[PDB]
Scaffold this active site. Structure first.
Site, PDB file in Angstrom:
ATOM      1  N   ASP A 298      45.416 -52.990  29.271  1.00 23.51           N
ATOM      2  CA  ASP A 298      45.952 -53.345  28.080  1.00 23.51           C
ATOM      3  C   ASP A 298      46.297 -54.583  27.586  1.00 23.51           C
ATOM      4  OD1 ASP A 298      48.496 -53.382  28.947  1.00 23.51           O
ATOM      5  OD2 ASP A 298      49.170 -52.484  26.989  1.00 23.51           O
TER       6      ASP A 298
ATOM      7  N   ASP B 259      55.229 -54.857  29.616  1.00 21.59           N
ATOM      8  CA  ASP B 259      55.416 -56.001  28.529  1.00 21.59           C
ATOM      9  C   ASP B 259      56.847 -56.538  29.067  1.00 21.59           C
ATOM     10  OD1 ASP B 259      54.433 -54.246  25.710  1.00 21.59           O
ATOM     11  OD2 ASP B 259      54.286 -56.659  26.073  1.00 21.59           O
TER      12      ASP B 259
ATOM     13  N   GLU C   9      61.285 -52.793  26.206  1.00 16.85           N
ATOM     14  CA  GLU C   9      60.259 -53.935  26.939  1.00 16.85           C
ATOM     15  C   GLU C   9      60.441 -55.365  26.759  1.00 16.85           C
ATOM     16  OE1 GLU C   9      56.861 -52.400  23.645  1.00 16.85           O
ATOM     17  OE2 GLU C   9      56.527 -52.382  25.735  1.00 16.85           O
TER      18      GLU C   9
ATOM     19  N   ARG D 162      52.008 -44.607  17.958  1.00 16.16           N
ATOM     20  CA  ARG D 162      52.608 -45.815  18.232  1.00 16.16           C
ATOM     21  C   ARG D 162      52.368 -46.914  17.377  1.00 16.16           C
ATOM     22  NH1 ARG D 162      53.106 -49.074  24.149  1.00 16.16           N
ATOM     23  NH2 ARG D 162      50.941 -48.924  23.840  1.00 16.16           N
TER      24      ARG D 162
HETATM   25  O1  LIG Z   1      54.579 -51.323  30.112  1.00 18.07           O
HETATM   26  C1  LIG Z   1      54.369 -51.358  28.676  1.00 18.07           C
HETATM   27  O2  LIG Z   1      54.592 -52.441  28.121  1.00 18.07           O
HETATM   28  C2  LIG Z   1      53.629 -50.620  28.082  1.00 18.07           C
HETATM   29  O3  LIG Z   1      53.618 -50.371  26.649  1.00 18.07           O
HETATM   30  C3  LIG Z   1      52.299 -50.071  28.649  1.00 18.07           C
HETATM   31  C4  LIG Z   1      51.030 -49.750  27.831  1.00 18.07           C
HETATM   32  O4  LIG Z   1      51.149 -49.201  26.785  1.00 18.07           O
HETATM   33  C5  LIG Z   1      49.815 -49.477  29.040  1.00 18.07           C
HETATM   34  C6  LIG Z   1      49.395 -50.344  29.876  1.00 18.07           C
HETATM   35  C7  LIG Z   1      48.438 -50.049  30.579  1.00 18.07           C
HETATM   36  C8  LIG Z   1      47.513 -48.981  30.222  1.00 18.07           C
HETATM   37  C9  LIG Z   1      47.777 -48.295  29.155  1.00 18.07           C
HETATM   38  C10 LIG Z   1      48.883 -48.507  28.603  1.00 18.07           C
HETATM   39 BR1  LIG Z   1      49.358 -47.203  26.905  1.00 18.07          BR
HETATM   40 MG   LIG Z   2      54.143 -52.380  25.875  1.00 24.20          MG
END
Ligand SMILES: O=C(O)C(=O)CC(=O)c1ccccc1Br
Ligand SMILES: [Mg+2]
Ligand SMILES: [Mg+2]
Ligand SMILES: [Mg+2]
Length: 715
Positions: free
Chosen positions: A622, A451, A423, A330
Site C-alpha cells: 500500500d 507509515d 503513525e 478510513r
Molecule cells: O502501517 C500503517 O501505516 C498502515 O496504515 C497500514 C496499512 O494501511 C496497510 C499496509 C499494508 C497493506 C494493507 C494496509 Br490497509
Molecule cells: Mg498508515
C-alpha cells in the site's frame, strides 16, 4: 466546464449528482442546506488546515538544519530533546485523565478480536470483508500453509482426505484448548446434545460437560441432536456445525462438518492508503460502495450482505447475533487536495474535509433500517479512522471538523467517533495529548507502524544513513513506540471503552508464520490488530482464544515502559555496516517493490497489490510500504551509500521483471522504453525527489502521475 456553482465552490457534476440523487435521499437533510454547509465549512476551516500543513514544513526544515549543523558524533540526546521542546515539536504531557467517549458499540469497547482493512473501491472485497464476521476454520486451515503440504497432505484438484484429517485434528485441539471438557478430549467426541439446558458431549466410554458450562452459548436444531452448538470464549463465538450427511461429516467421529469462528469483529472500509482515487470520478466510485454498504444493498455477482444469525439459548428461548462486521471508514488525512471541488480561483479543496462531509453523510444510512434492521451502529455512532495526523493540534482540528460536519448533517454532537492512527513521530511523542484532544470522540488508537517507519526515516533524513528496511522492526525506537502506545491507551482508560490496536500482517501467503508470530500482538495487550483478508481474520482469531487480552491489559495498568529518550532513538546505521552484495540486495529489493506497486497504481488505478519481493515473498503493498522503500533509498542516496547510477541501474534491471510478473492485459510494459512510461517515471521520481516530499508522503507524486496517465489515455 462540467461543474456546479455553489457559493464559492465549483463542484464536479458527477459528485454533485451522486450526492443529490444517491446520498441525500433518505436522510431528511435539505439538499440546498447541505451544499450551503459544504461551502461554509470549506471556507471556514481551509485556513487552519493550511496552517497546520505549513507548520509541519517549518518544523521539518528546522530539524533538517539542526542535523546538518551537528559536529558532535554520538548525537547528544539531552540537547536534541531540548531542541525539539524549544521549537514546539515536543509538547508538555498533560495530567492523567480518562476518556469519556460514549454511545460506542460492544465490538469496539469490549470485544477483543481481529480488525480487517479493505479497499472501499473494490466492491467484491468490501462485501467479503463485511461478511467476514463469521468464517470457516476448516477452509482457512485446508486452504493455507497452516497445515503443511508434507508428503501425503498436499492440496490438489480434489479433496485430499489425509489433509482433511489434519485439518480436523487441528480444530479438535483448538476446541480442547479453548472450551475444555470436564474430562476427555473433543478429539474423541461421538456426539453432542442439550439436556436440562446443558451441553452434553458423548465420549466412547462415558459422557461429559464443559469444565465451564458458561461457555455454552446456545445451539440450532433440536436439543436432542442439535444441528450446531455455539460456544463462547474470551467474548468470541465458536460454532461447531454438526452434519453427518456432509462429505466431511461422514468421515468425522462425531459427524462434525466445520468449525466456524467469529473472526473480523470490525472492518475498516478504506478511502486512504489502499485505494487510488485522484478525481471526482474515482471518489464517487468509492462513495457509492460505502453507500451500498450502509444502505445494505451493495451486490456483485448475486453476492450480498449477510443477515444476523439465529440461535436457541441454552434454556430454550431465542436470540440473535450480528452477522456482519461492524464498519469503520478510513478517511484521508489533512494533506491532499482533490479537484472534485475547486473554488472560484481554481484552487482544489482539501480532500479530508470532503471525506468528513461525504462519508459522514453516507454513514447516516447505516444508522437506519435497510430494505431489514439497520446495517451498522445500533448505539448511534459513526466510526471514522483518521490517518497521518502530526500532534495534538491536528487532532483538535479533526475534532472541530467533525463537529462542524455534525451541524451540517443535523446529527447530535459527537456522533462521529475517531479511530486515531499513531503513525507519525510528532503524534507518538505527544500521544497522551493527542488522545486528550479527542477525549470524547476517540474509539481507538492504533500503531500504523509502516507509515510510522516512513516518518522516522524522513524526520531524521539529514542525520545520516539509516539501517536497512528489514532491520527497522527490531530497532529501539519502534519497540518503544509499540509499548508507549499501549501504555498511553491503558492510562487513558481504554480497557472496556476503546480499542488498543496494532498493525498489519503483509505476508498474505505466509499463514503458518502469521499463526506462529502475530500472537505477540494480543500478548502485548492489544485488543485488536490488522489482517489483510477474511482468511487471515479467521486465523488471527485463534490468538484471541489463546490470549486473555482483558487480563493482559489489567496486568499492564499503570506501567511506564518507554522513555522519551527511547522513543527518540534515531535508527542510524553503523560505519561500514554493509558489504557491496548487501547494499545491492537492499537497492534491488526496494526498487522491485516500488515498481511492482507503482506500475499498477499509475496505469490501472489499483491502490493495493500483492507484489513478490526479491525473496519471492508475496507482500500486500500500500502507500505506507511505498513510503518506507522510497524514503530509505532517498536517504541512502542523500548520504552516499549508493550513487544515482546505482538507482537508475536497479530500476531498469527490476522493471522487466515486474513486466514479466504482470504479463494480463490492461498492463503496459515499462521496459525497454523507460522514458515513455509514466509509471516508471513515477517510481523514479518517488526516489530521486523523495527527500523533498512533505514528510516523505507519496500521494503528491502518485496523484500527479495517475492524472497524467489518465490524460494521455483520453487523448
Ligand atoms: O502501517 C500503517 O501505516 C498502515 O496504515 C497500514 C496499512 O494501511 C496497510 C499496509 C499494508 C497493506 C494493507 C494496509 Br490497509
Ligand atoms: Mg498508515
Ligand atoms: Mg531542505
Ligand atoms: Mg481464558
Amino acid at each position: 466546464t462540467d461543474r456546479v456553482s455553489v457559493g464559492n465552490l465549483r463542484i464536479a457534476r458527477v459528485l454533485y449528482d451522486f450526492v443529490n440523487n444517491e446520498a441525500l435521499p433518505g436522510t431528511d437533510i435539505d439538499p440546498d442546506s447541505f451544499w450551503a454547509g459544504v461551502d461554509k465549512v470549506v471556507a471556514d476551516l481551509t485556513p487552519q488546515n493550511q496552517a497546520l500543513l505549513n507548520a509541519r514544513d517549518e518544523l521539518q526544515a528546522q530539524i533538517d538544519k539542526w542535523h546538518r549543523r551537528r559536529v558532535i558524533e554520538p548525537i547528544d540526546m539531552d540537547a536534541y530533546r531540548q531542541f525539539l521542546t524549544e521549537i514546539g515539536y515536543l509538547l508538555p504531557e498533560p495530567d492523567d485523565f480518562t476518556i469519556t467517549t460514549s454511545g460506542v458499540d460492544a465490538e469496539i469497547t469490549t470485544t477483543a478480536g481481529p480488525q480487517l482493512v479493505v479497499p472501499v473501491l473494490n466492491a467484491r472485497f468490501a462485501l467479503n470483508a463485511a461478511n467476514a464476521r463469521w468464517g470457516s476454520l476448516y477452509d482457512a486451515l485446508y486452504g493455507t500453509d497452516v497445515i503443511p503440504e508434507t508428503d501425503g497432505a498436499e492440496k490438489g484438484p480434489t479433496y485430499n482426505k489425509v489433509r482433511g484429517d489434519k485439518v480436523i485434528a487441528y480444530a479438535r485441539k483448538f476446541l480442547d484448548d479453548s472450551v475444555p471438557l470436564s474430562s476427555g478430549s473433543f478429539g474423541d467426541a461421538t456426539g453432542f446434545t442439550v439436556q436440562d439446558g446443558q451441553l452434553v458431549v458423548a465420549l466412547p466410554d462415558k459422557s461429559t460437560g464443559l469444565a465451564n458450562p458458561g461457555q455454552f452459548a446456545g445451539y440450532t436444531g433440536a436439543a436432542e441432536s442439535p444441528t450446531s452448538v455455539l460456544l463462547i470464549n474470551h467474548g468470541l463465538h465458536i460454532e461447531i456445525l454438526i452434519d453427518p450427511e456432509s462429505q466431511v461429516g461422514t468421515t468425522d467421529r462425531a459427524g462434525v462438518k466445520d468449525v466456524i469462528l467469529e473472526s473480523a469483529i470490525t472492518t475498516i472500509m478504506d478511502f486512504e492508503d489502499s485505494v487510488a482515487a485522484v478525481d471526482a470520478a474515482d471518489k464517487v466510485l468509492g462513495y457509492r460502495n460505502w453507500l451500498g454498504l450502509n444502505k445494505g444493498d451493495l451486490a456483485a455477482a448475486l453476492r450480498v450482505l449477510n443477515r444476523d444469525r439465529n440461535y436457541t439459548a441454552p434454556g430454550g428461548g431465542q436470540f440473535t447475533l450480528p452477522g456482519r462486521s461492524l464498519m469503520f471508514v478510513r478517511n484521508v488525512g489533512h494533506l491532499m487536495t482533490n479537484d472534485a471541488i475547486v473554488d472560484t480561483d481554481g484552487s482544489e479543496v482539501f480532500e479530508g474535509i470532503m471525506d468528513a462531509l461525504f462519508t459522514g453523510l453516507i454513514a447516516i444510512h447505516g444508522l437506519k433500517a435497510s430494505d431489514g434492521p439497520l446495517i451498522n451502529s445500533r448505539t448511534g455512532s459513526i466510526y471514522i479512522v483518521k490517518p497521518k495526523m502530526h500532534g495534538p493540534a491536528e487532532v483538535a482540528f479533526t475534532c472541530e471538523l467533525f463537529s462542524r460536519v455534525e451541524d451540517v448533517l443535523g446529527l447530535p454532537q459527537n456522533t462521529m467517533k475517531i479511530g486515531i492512527m499513531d503513525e507519525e513521530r510528532r503524534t507518538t511523542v505527544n500521544l497522551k495529548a493527542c488522545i486528550k484532544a479527542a477525549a470524547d470522540r476517540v474509539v481507538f488508537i492504533n500503531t500504523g507502524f509502516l507509515d510510522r517507519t516512513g516518518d522516522e526515516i524522513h524526520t531524521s533524513m539529514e542525520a545520516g544513513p539509516m539501517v536497512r528496511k528489514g532491520t527497522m522492526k527490531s530497532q529501539p525506537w519502534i519497540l518503544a513506540y509499540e509499548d508507549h502506545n499501549v501504555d498511553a491507551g491503558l492510562a487513558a482508560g481504554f480497557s472496556g471503552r476503546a480499542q488498543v490496536g496494532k498493525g498489519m500482517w503483509t505476508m498474505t501467503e505466509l499463514m503458518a508464520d502469521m499463526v506462529e508470530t502475530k500472537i505477540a500482538q494480543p500478548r502485548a495487550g492489544a485488543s485488536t490488530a490488522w489482517v489483510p483478508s477474511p482468511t487471515a481474520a479467521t486465523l488471527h482469531a485463534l490468538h484471541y482464544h489463546q490470549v486473555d487480552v482483558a487480563a493482559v491489559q489489567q496486568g499492564l495498568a499503570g506501567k511506564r515502559r518507554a522513555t522519551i529518550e527511547q522513543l527518540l532513538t534515531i535508527p542510524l546505521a553503523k560505519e561500514l555496516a554493509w558489504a557491496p552484495d548487501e547494499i545491492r540486495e537492499e537497492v534491488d529489493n526496494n526498487c522491485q517493490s516500488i515498481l511492482g506497486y507503482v506500475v499498477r497504481w499509475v496505469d490501472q488505478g489499483v491502490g493495493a497489490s500483492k507484489v513478490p519481493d526479491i525473496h519471492d515473498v508475496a507482500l500486500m503493498e500500500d502507500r505506507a510500504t511505498l513510503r518506507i522503500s522510497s524514503q530509505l533509498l532517498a536517504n541512502w542516496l542523500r548520504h552516499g551509500v549508493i550513487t544515482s547510477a546505482d538507482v537508475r541501474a536497479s530500476l531498469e534491471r527490476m522493471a522487466p521483471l515486474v513486466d514479466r510478473q504482470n504479463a494480463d492485459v490492461a498492463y503496459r510494459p515499462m521496459a525497454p522504453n523507460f522514458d515513455d512510461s509514466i509509471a516508471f517515471l513515477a517510481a523514479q521520481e518517488l526516489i530521486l525527489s523523495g527527500a523533498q516530499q512533505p514528510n516523505g508522503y507519496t500521494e503528491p507524486i502518485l496523484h500527479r502521475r495517475r492524472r497524467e496517465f489518465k490524460a494521455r489515455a483520453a487523448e
